[PDB]
Amino acid sequence: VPESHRKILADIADEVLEKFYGCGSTLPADGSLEGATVLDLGCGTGRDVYLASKLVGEHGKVIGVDMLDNQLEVARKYVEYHAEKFFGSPSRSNVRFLKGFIENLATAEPEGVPDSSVDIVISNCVCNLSTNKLALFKEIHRVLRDGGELYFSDVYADRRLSEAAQQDPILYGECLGGALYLEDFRRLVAEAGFRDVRLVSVGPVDVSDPQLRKLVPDVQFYSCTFRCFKVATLEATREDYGQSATYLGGIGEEFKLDRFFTFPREKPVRVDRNTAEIIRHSRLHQWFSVSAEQQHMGLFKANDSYALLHAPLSMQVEQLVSG
């Protein structure tokens, strides 16, 4: 748990923390959340929704969605509690909880999530239990505004799992059985409208149980945090238009966009046009200066890892996990 989050979580209601299921949804840099609308898919008792409530502040909004009746009951019980805690009055909540399948946010109760209404969609380990991944990614694309991002952690494989592995109930329940091969994931989210997948962090996921392991013998599983921006002008490729971007400060000493792009305060960093357009059209434009496009110069190479930058997603992940 990040240090900045500890103080906030210490103010969240015991019952919310005690009954919260799963790992916390990882969040973009705290300062970048100010005034944003955040949607947590699979919100449970609302631990992450309440954490985000404080971070987005009074001008931001947070929405949680879940289909677990009894978790949502807990979440809804504490709307006033956390409005008092964070904003000085029980009437000043910026959160709401909706009941629905994450594969159809338009039919959630008591209200659906509108088109183009959300800045950041967050989630942890929800995909591999989804009954329809493509439908889910399409829904996420629909609710995001232009410049918004899906910033999420899930489990992926370095190869395609066998049918036997995909049918196993213990692997299923562990979020392993439903894991996609990283290249299949890339193609699926591209079909949904997400043209550029950025790797934020990656850790290994072990399957040591010998019985289960026999179903996935040489598979390497990874926990990956990706950010996928909805930006109309993105291309499938990372092209050089001679641009630089400079982080202006205000939301940390540096801004780390992904494993390839770190922006020190007030220093220019050369960027490909997709990265430029992400900064310009997303909420990040508030803290950045991005130079004008020049003539196309070909593929972007002005990065100390440019070869990996253009490599398949499996190569980025395997090489960045460690060593």
Taking CA atoms, 90 is separated from 84, 129, 185, 230, in Å, by 5, 36, 43, 35
Count CB atoms within 10 A of the CB of residue 146: 12
Site for Ca ion in 54-113 (CB under 5 A): none
Q: How far apart are CA 207 and CA 204, in angstroms?
A: 10
272 is in an annotated binding site: no
Backbone angles phi and psi of 148, in degrees to 5: -75, 165
CB of 46 to Ca ion, least distance (A): 9
Interface region with Ca ion, contact rule CB under 5 A, candidates 40-48, 229-237, 266-274, 293-301: 40-48
17 binds Ca ion (CB under 5 A): no
Q: How far apart are CA 31 and CA 33, in angstroms?
A: 5
CB of 51 to Ca ion, least distance (A): 11
Which residues have CB under 8 Å from 201's CB, separation 6+? 26, 224, 225, 259
158 is in an annotated binding site: yes
Q: 24 or 147: whose CB is closer to Ca ion? A: 24
Q: 97 or 247: whose CB is closer to Ca ion? A: 97
CB of 314 to Ca ion, least distance (A): 26
Interface region with Ca ion, contact rule CB under 5 A, candidates 35-43, 93-101, 133-141, 231-239: 35-43
Which residues have CB under 8 Å from 80's CB, separation 6+? 90, 91, 93
Q: 28 or 42: whose CB is closer to Ca ion? A: 42
Cβ pair 296, 240 in contact under 8 A: yes
42 is in an annotated binding site: yes
319 is in an annotated binding site: no
Q: What angle do CA 75, 81, 87 make, to 5 degrees?
A: 120
149 is in an annotated binding site: no
Q: 64 or 147: whose CB is closer to Ca ion? A: 64
**Stretch (H or E) spanning 247:** strand 243-247
Size of the site for Ca ion (CB under 5 A): 2
Q: 101 or 306: whose CB is closer to Ca ion? A: 101
Torsion of Cα atoms, 229 then 1 then 266 then 226, to 10°: -20
CB of 264 to Ca ion, least distance (A): 33
Q: 42 or 177: whose CB is closer to Ca ion? A: 42
42 binds Ca ion (CB under 5 A): yes
Q: How far apart are CA 1 and CA 24, in angstroms?
A: 9
Q: 22 or 249: whose CB is closer to Ca ion? A: 22
21 is in an annotated binding site: yes
Torsion of Cα atoms, 48 then 196 then 134 then 203, to 10°: -50
Q: Distance from first CA to last CA of the chain, Å, rounded?
A: 25
CB of 143 to Ca ion, least distance (A): 17
102 is in an annotated binding site: yes
22 binds Ca ion (CB under 5 A): yes
Q: Which residues are annotated as a binding site for S-adenosyl-L-methionine?
A: 21, 66, 71, 102-103
Which chain residues interact with Ca ion by CB under 5 A? 22, 42
Tell me the binding residues for Ca(2+).
42, 158, 220, 318
